[PDB]
Amino acid sequence: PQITLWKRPLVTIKIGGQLKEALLDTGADDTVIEEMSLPGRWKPKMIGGIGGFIKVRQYDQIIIEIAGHKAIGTVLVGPTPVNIIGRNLLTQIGATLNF
Amino acid sequence: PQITLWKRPLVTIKIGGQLKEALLDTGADDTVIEEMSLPGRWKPKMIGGIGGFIKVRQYDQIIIEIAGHKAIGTVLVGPTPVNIIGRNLLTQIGATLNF
Ligand SMILES: COc1ccc(S(=O)(=O)N(CC(C)C)C[C@@H](O)[C@H](Cc2ccccc2)NC(=O)O[C@H]2CCO[C@H]3OC[C@H](OC)[C@H]32)cc1
Ligand SMILES: [Cl-]
Ligand SMILES: [Cl-]
Ligand SMILES: [Cl-]
Ligand code: NA
Ligand code: NA
């Protein structure tokens, strides 16, 4: 698809068999999701945004569907205000910015 | 152009007579630039992201040149860790996300 930017680029994702809404975010290096349970072990990570830093849980090799495209990769879980799909998974679904 | 997302989508901008580097950011509603002077009136605003909120100055009707494309709109100035071109100006240069 071709998504214009007059509205937020929100899409449906599926993770852990649950549908959620998430933002397609070219300004995010990493994918960050609100608190939820994921399988496996996690590692610590610190991420920085506009207001300062937060601690998140890094889960690797998680299956996640994004706007109907399958991805398998790293998902950060933490107190993000919105679910964000960052460049690590935008590249897996083949997304580009065009103008 | 077509910008892939393997790396941060940074471009050169010109704002206030100054050249700067900024991130093309589909997850940002608004454009936020590190502290600089701009002419005209402004009013205070709070904007929030990962980490929490920062106070910024809102300047309206500011011209930016973004990777060689001119646009006009509101620019927020404050202690952002990076210069962000958000959707309010990405729309004006015709930027879309494609997959
Ligand atoms: C109302 O108008 C705005 C309100 C909020 C923002 S924002 O900057 O807070 N942000 C909104 C989303 C969080 C919903 C835009 C977002 O693209 C920022 C843009 C950004 C980028 C760098 C620093 C600050 C902000 N990215 C970000 O926070 O990235 C974090 C989490 C994802 O992994 C890392 O990627 C970069 C950063 O690691 C340095 C980590 C912008 C305009
Ligand atoms: Cl990944
Ligand atoms: Cl605007
Ligand atoms: Cl359009
Ligand atoms: Na894992
Ligand atoms: Na003005």
The CATH number of the domain where B90 resides is what? 2.40.70.10
Q: What is the Cα gyration radius of chain A? A: 13
The residues, ordered by sequence, that sit 6+ positions from B28 with a Cβ below 8 Å of its Cβ are A27, B84, B85, B86, B87
Resolution in A: 1.2
Q: Which helix (H) or strand (E) holds A89?
A: helix A87-90
Q: Retrieve residue A3's tokens.
A: 């998504």
* Segments forming the whole domain that contains residue B19: 1-99
Nearest residue to A12 (alpha-carbon basis) of A89, A60, A62, A83: A83
Can you tell me the distance from the alpha carbon of A25 to that of A9, in angstroms, rounded to the nearest whole number? 8
Which chain B residues are Cβ-neighbours of A99 within 8 angstroms?
1, 67, 69, 90, 93-96
Nearest residue to A62 via CA among A92, A23, A24: A92
C-beta separation of A71 from A64 below 8 A = yes
Rounded Cα gap, residues A29 and A46, in angstroms: 13
Q: What is the 3-state secondary structure (H, E, C) of A19-77?
A: EEEEEECCCCCCCEECCCCCCCCCEEEEEEECCEEEEEEEEEEEEEEECCEEEEEEEEE
Q: Is A87 helix (H, G, I), strand (E, B) or coil?
A: helix
* Total number of domains in chain B: 1
Check A8 against B29: CB less than 8 A apart. yes
Check: CB of residue B64 under 8 Å from CB of residue B14.
yes
Tell me if chain B has a CB within 8 Å of the CB of A55: no
Q: Is A25 noted as a catalytic residue in this protein?
A: yes
Are A5 and B91 an interchain contact pair (Cβ–Cβ within 8 Å)? yes
Distances (CA, A) of B20 to B45, B47, B92: 23, 21, 19
